């Protein structure tokens, strides 16, 4: 009974990261040495785990977050950070348990003339709490004067297309970007490895 | 977290040896590659050295260069033999948390970086 991390680390599509994705893991074995044993991954950072020992542990629930953001970005999704993404778009906890795993899709995500499909926030009022997501769309006030539902200076519409295009520089190109959480609830482990 | 280079003038067939040692953090994890940049010209890629102690080199002309690294030490070598004057360059150590066996040619994918040593040939 092998847990679907094909389908999230080869799904045809991701999400933009303003819109994350979340994939519940139940009630599988998981092999996470087909992920660390291999070459295809530049960013591969462990919180409160050892990368070679993941097989041996065992977790009631594994959620796996996936979205693109640019190469740039890829260090905002860690513990502690700041920036657009971390702020407005998807935030870690302090004391996350799990891996950020990412790696260039610039083979796939980038667009002669653009790719528009892949949004970030660009504006908010406050940043967001660990793991909440916010896909509202209302006109974002930057400066004293109320819109009225009409766009303008200071009136945005708050979210961005990244617009990825091929020949863009590598730290403007398309990450593809899979958190795992490693759910730790005192309860049966229902996700553990081959072992 | 500090990643520090040492062992760099030489001149023609000689050899020179390179260390980057680094505090603040342990380096197992991580992958390690050297990169070299010349005046006038563009930075370029050297060699690399995975997590898993894999060896990759980027320029064809260092395919007379070897790489090793001391997890025991926290440290990596770049052993440089049958220098050459197109060899004077600063030189750079880079690390970055990646897959077990990655090891990548574009500078732009490493987050920390020592301070640099010139070579001279």
């Known amino acids: 009974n092998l847990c679907p991390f094909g389908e999230v680390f080869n799904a045809t599509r991701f999400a933009s990261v303003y819109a994350w994705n979340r994939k519940r893991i139940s009630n599988c074995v998981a092999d996470y040495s087909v992920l660390y044993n291999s070459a295809s991954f530049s960013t591969f950072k462990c919180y409160g785990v050892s990368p070679t020992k993941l097989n041996d542990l065992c977790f009631t629930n594994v959620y796996a977050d996936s979205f693109v953001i640019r190469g740039d970005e890829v260090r905002q999704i860690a513990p502690g950070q700041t920036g657009k993404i971390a702020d407005y778009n998807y935030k870690l906890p302090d004391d996350f348990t799990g891996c950020v795993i990412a790696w260039n899709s610039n083979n796939l995500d980038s667009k002669v003339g653009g790719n528009y499909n892949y949004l970030y926030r660009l504006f908010r009022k406050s940043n967001l709490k660990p793991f909440e997501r916010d896909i509202s769309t209302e006109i974002y006030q930057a400066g004293s004067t109320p819109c009225n539902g009409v766009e303008g200076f200071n009136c945005y519409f708050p979210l961005q297309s990244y617009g990825f295009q091929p020949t863009n520089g590598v730290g403007y190109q398309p990450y593809r970007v899979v958190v795992l959480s490693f759910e730790l609830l005192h309860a049966p482990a229902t996700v553990c490895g081959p072992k | 977290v500090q990643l520090v280079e040492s062992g760099g003038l030489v001149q023609p067939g000689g050899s020179l040896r390179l260390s980057c040692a680094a505090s603040g953090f342990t380096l197992d994890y991580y992958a390690i590659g050297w990169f070299r940049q010349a005046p006038g010209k563009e930075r370029e890629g050297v060699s690399c050295?995975?997590?898993?102690?894999?060896?990759?080199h980027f320029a064809d002309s260092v395919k007379r260069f070897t790489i090793s690294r001391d997890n025991a030490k926290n440290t990596v070598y770049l052993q440089m033999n049958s220098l050459i004057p197109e060899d004077t360059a600063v030189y750079y150590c880079?690390?970055?948390?990646?897959?077990?066996?990655?090891?990548?040619?574009?500078?732009?994918?490493?987050?920390?970086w020592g301070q640099g040593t010139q070579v001279t040939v």
């Open positions: 050295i995975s997590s898993s102690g894999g060896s990759t």
């Open positions: 880079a690390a970055q948390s990646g897959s077990y066996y990655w090891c990548g040619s574009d500078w732009h994918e490493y987050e920390y």
